[PDB]
């Protein structure tokens, strides 16, 4: 039944995987309003689509920047995968297109802001609050993994909160369609599984590790492995010694020891029973998996929204001209975008 849902999920995905959509809008169809967040290659803007009056979030990427950091393949992955998936907790790519200078991905605008923002402000999430979010990540990973995808960038900064208080996963920059192991050193330092750091070759288990980090950070208000510089963080991760807050439940601590498990033969999500080891853990006993999927659970926190266009849940950023050269940059490199 999940097998059968997943089965037909995979058909839908593969069709799009094999024949991706391209060139579904253009720059002049949108008025650009405000920057919602910035990134290594550009920025994301609140925009308003002229003909419909809908708001969207427009991810702008400078092709030259992308090339410079050798992120071509990853960027192509990001778009190919994003246009192909369909899940309740995955942000929807609405349009995509390119011009002389930039790549554009236009997504649904997730107005509630980043989980980050909320987490740092509130301090930490109660275990029931944390569990609500975690459940959504679990189902999402079950979905992605089933398609031979690895996500590889779980963190509060990549999780948006929608108007119903549910999660929208964003940033597929490191997502990859892989059968078997892969080797790229990528992610975010606090969230890296030891086997990435150790340059061993790794698989989808790294996502389950990250889940542990996320759940810890959510419930604690700080990550299990932190320091001033990435290098000291990696030391800690590798040791894998973890200390828990006084307030963590026994059940939580037990779940965490099994996710933050250096031994792949022992890590939850990577065993014979797979995800069911997670879904069936005592920490999730009160969790209604179907109701979560169906968005019937009432959320613990609902962002204030006043109107379409409201960016109150978002930090302010400095703005800058979008520039489009008269000459085509990196045309061949980005042919399939």
């Amino acid at each position: 039944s999940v097998k059968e849902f997943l089965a037909k999920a995979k058909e839908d995905f593969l069709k799009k995987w094999e024949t991706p959509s391209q060139n579904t809008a253009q720059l002049d169809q949108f008025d650009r309003i405000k920057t919602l967040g910035t990134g290594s290659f550009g920025r994301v803007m609140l925009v308003k689509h002229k003909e419909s009056g809908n708001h969207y979030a427009m991810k702008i990427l400078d092709k030259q920047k992308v090339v410079k950091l050798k992120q071509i393949e990853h960027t192509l992955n990001e778009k190919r995968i994003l246009q192909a998936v369909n899940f309740p907790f995955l942000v929807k790519l609405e349009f995509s297109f390119k011009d002389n200078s930039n790549l554009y991905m236009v997504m649904e605008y997730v107005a509630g802001g980043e989980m980050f923002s909320h987490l740092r402000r509130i301090g930490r999430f109660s275990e029931p609050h944390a569990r609500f979010y975690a459940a959504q990540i679990v189902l999402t990973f079950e979905y992605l993994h089933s398609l031979d995808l690895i996500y590889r960038d779980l963190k509060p900064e990549n999780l948006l909160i929608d108007q119903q208080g549910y999660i929208q996963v964003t940033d597929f920059g490191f997502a990859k369609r892989v059968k078997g192991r892969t080797w790229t050193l990528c992610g975010t330092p606090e969230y890296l599984a030891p086997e990435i750091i150790l340059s061993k070759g790794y698989n989808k288990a790294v996502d389950w590790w990250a889940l542990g980090v996320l759940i810890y950070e959510m419930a604690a208000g700080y990550p299990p492995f932190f320091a001033d510089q990435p290098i000291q963080i990696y030391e800690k991760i590798v040791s894998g010694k973890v200390r828990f807050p006084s307030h963590f439940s026994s059940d939580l601590k037990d779940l965490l020891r099994n996710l933050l498990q250096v031994d792949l033969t022992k890590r939850f999500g990577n065993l014979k029973n797979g995800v069911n080891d997670i879904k069936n853990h005592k920490w999730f006993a009160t969790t209604d998996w179907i109701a979560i999927y169906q968005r019937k659970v009432e959320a613990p926190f609902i962002p204030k929204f006043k109107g379409p266009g409201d960016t109150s849940n978002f930090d302010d950023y400095e703005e800058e001209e979008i520039r489009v050269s008269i000459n085509e940059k990196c045309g061949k490199e980005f042919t399939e975008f």
Binding site: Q71, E157, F174, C186, T188, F226
Partner: peptide, 20 residues
């Protein structure tokens, strides 16, 4: 406290991906 140590650290803001 761990919290205090976290909060005094240089990594309380949005964290950058790496791709080394």
């Amino acid at each position: 406290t761990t919290y205090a140590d976290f909060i005094a650290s240089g990594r309380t803001g949005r964290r950058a991906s790496i791709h080394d």
